[model samples]
Target: SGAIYVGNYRVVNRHLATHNDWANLVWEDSSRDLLVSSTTAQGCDTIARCDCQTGVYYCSSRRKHYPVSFSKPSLIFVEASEYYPARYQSHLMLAVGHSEPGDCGGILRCQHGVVGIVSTGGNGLVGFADVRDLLWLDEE
Candidate 1:
């Protein structure tokens, strides 16, 4: 069992999708974290658990604060790239608005729950492997 710290949370378990399209992690929650409103391009409103240690949702990569109502846009069309092959299905693309290298691995939640995790990025767009099916599969 290996653990890594993503900001203040210590992630103990890691999970990868069947096709290596997306991944998820298990972390220890604390009172310092808070739930915030997040939305997708389709105007699907959902919730995200964010670390509020610095008083606001913090993005360590840019050293910026994401407000309580941070929103994301879903990208309907994404070209296959080296990191993301064409055969890899269950992709959820988005316009992350920022071009930061560390944006990958971030969670992408929709009305159906966590649909994907940030995996690929280029040309002002970011891609994630849709893990909703895997999540349901694991429940059984």
Candidate 2:
């Protein structure tokens, strides 16, 4: 389902990008303000900007918030012979070293901001849509 529940808020609208693996959810409640920020990391300095880093944090529906390092800023292909053949899906994703069970709409945050959204994972690696690519959708 497209509906998403975050804490006490429910998503009233959903914006999904057709060109890339990214989406944004709008909560039904307008009275409460949501801040775009990150949690405190022990022994780690805060990063105010977005970039590939070793301190990338992942928060998902199935897993508690945890830190994971990004291996690549982009991926060239999906690595499947029968799916989306010969297409170039470059510069729209973040590759991480760890592979864990994650929901499709999971939020990926870096030191002090969101960086990506969980899209797919397997074979010792995980892939997600870069938040930069979702800027156009958020503007709508």
Identify the candidate with maximal lDDT: 2
Runs in model 2 with CA error above 4 Å? 1-49, 56-62, 81-86, 92-102, 133-140
Q: What CA RMSD would candidate 1 show?
A: 12.7
Q: Write the per-residue lDDT of candidate 2 for residues 1-140, one digit (tens) a residue.
A: 12122232222112222222122233211111111211122222211245555445444443565567664555455543322344444444545445454344455566455555555566655655444433332322
lDDT of each: 0.33, 0.40
Worst 10 residues of 2 by lDDT: 28-37
Q: Pick the candidate with the highest TM-score.
A: 2
Count of steric clashes across candidates, in order: 0, 0
How does candidate 1 score on lDDT?
Answer: 0.33
List where candidate 1 sits over 4 angstroms from the true fold: 1-60, 63-90, 135-140
Listing every candidate in turn, what is its Cα RMSD in Å to the true structure after a full C-alpha superposition? 12.7, 10.6
Give candidate 1's TM-score.
Answer: 0.37
